[PDB]
Design a protein around this ligand. Structure first.
Ligand SMILES: O=P(O)(O)OC[C@H]1O[C@H](OP(=O)(O)OP(=O)(O)O)[C@H](O)[C@@H]1O
Ligand SMILES: O=P(O)(O)OC[C@H]1O[C@H](OP(=O)(O)OP(=O)(O)O)[C@H](O)[C@@H]1O
Ligand SMILES: Nc1ncnc2cc[nH]c12
Ligand SMILES: Nc1ncnc2cc[nH]c12
Ligand SMILES: [Mg+2]
Ligand SMILES: [Mg+2]
Lengths: 179, 179
């Protein structure tokens, strides 16, 4: 049976993508290899076994893949945080900047989150930490209490120290793999 | 325990979204309600129990949520079909048109699919059928045999007769819910 380290060995590093200068970490082979996807899933589910999570909040769009898997595995609902203009109904918004794009805007439906929730914010990669910091703000504006947010990412690029950045709003950050 | 019909009862119909004229079917409450997400998942997994699926191919972006869940539940890898310019490495492409956007381009990594695969193409909603028809072309260009593609959607809007459209390329189409 594959281990988390085996999953790590499946990651491809593509230079100059999506633009020259950025070394893209392609985690696609982890998702397409069942034994690897399981290893990573089990690591996440085991880590939060004693945490009363009530909702998994996944970030559009790569945060949706292992995001739904983890929610269903934990037995809790999945909530989508997505790019502006996509979610119908009442929504909370927040504009931010990430590694290769400025002026991004994420949204979440007001009705999907509130003070009773314990959220597991999940995304695939932690780079600078802008998407997640903006994500934490979204959840808090929707009513979720600061102490009730937990963050999980599949891959953490420690180089850009996003953990410290995100640390200003949330210090319960668990990453399956560190570069 | 909730049933598929209960899940259906959770869908919201938002008028004039994303633009006036289009009645958006919001399936978000199904995903955020664990009992509903399970009911729908079990319906999909039970339907393909006797099918030797080797890969679930989910369509960016709403096709990612139940897409990964179903792949992990079936014990097979997940492959992302996404909007152009996002996937690194060698890719196959195909441009199409859907209900509220013209000139869309989807891509898939060449290495993720081939002749040995039996694919379960999954997307959340079947409207006109353009995204899926374009999706079938992508898989076939990547090497997947026509007889080895199966299609699944969470919600089918029979009004726009997308099943007939997609039927020109694939007639193994299973929809959890029909409007
Ligand atoms: O730590 P940060 O610097 O904020 O960068 C990380 C985020 O950027 C990427 O998403 P992207 O915006 O490319 O969207 P996608 O998921 O649709 O690829 C990645 O999937 C993370 O969500
Ligand atoms: O049958 P069709 O007319 O092709 O329309 C259906 C497709 O359109 C919507 O996706 P959208 O393009 O809005 O992308 P999203 O998943 O990012 O919302 C929906 O999620 C289906 O994928
Ligand atoms: N280097 C990198 N690799 C993969 N995803 C992201 C997202 C931001 N930076 C990235
Ligand atoms: N009416 C509709 N509702 C939800 N998604 C889509 C996607 C195309 N048409 C749609
Ligand atoms: Mg992302
Ligand atoms: Mg879609």
């Amino acid at each position: 049976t594959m281990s988390v380290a085996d999953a790590h060995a499946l990651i491809k590093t593509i230079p100059d993508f999506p633009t020259k200068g950025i070394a893209f970490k392609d985690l696609s082979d982890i998702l397409s290899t069942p034994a690897a996807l399981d290893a990573v899933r089990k690591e996440v589910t085991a880590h939060y076994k004693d945490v009363p999570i009530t909702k998994v909040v996944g970030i559009e769009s790569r945060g949706f893949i292992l995001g739904g898997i983890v929610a269903n595995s934990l037995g809790v609902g999945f909530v989508a945080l997505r790019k502006a203009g996509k979610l119908p109904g009442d929504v909370c918004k927040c504009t931010f900047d990430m590694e290769y794009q400025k002026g991004v805007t994420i949204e979440v439906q007001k009705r999907q989150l509130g003070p009773h929730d314990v959220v597991l914010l999940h995304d695939d990669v932690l780079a600078t930490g802008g998407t997640l910091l903006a994500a934490i703000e979204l959840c808090e504006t929707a009513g979720v209490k600061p102490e009730n947010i937990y963050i999980n990412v599949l891959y953490e690029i420690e180089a850009l120290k996003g953990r410290e950045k995100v640390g200003q709003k949330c210090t319960r950050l668990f990453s399956v793999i560190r570069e």
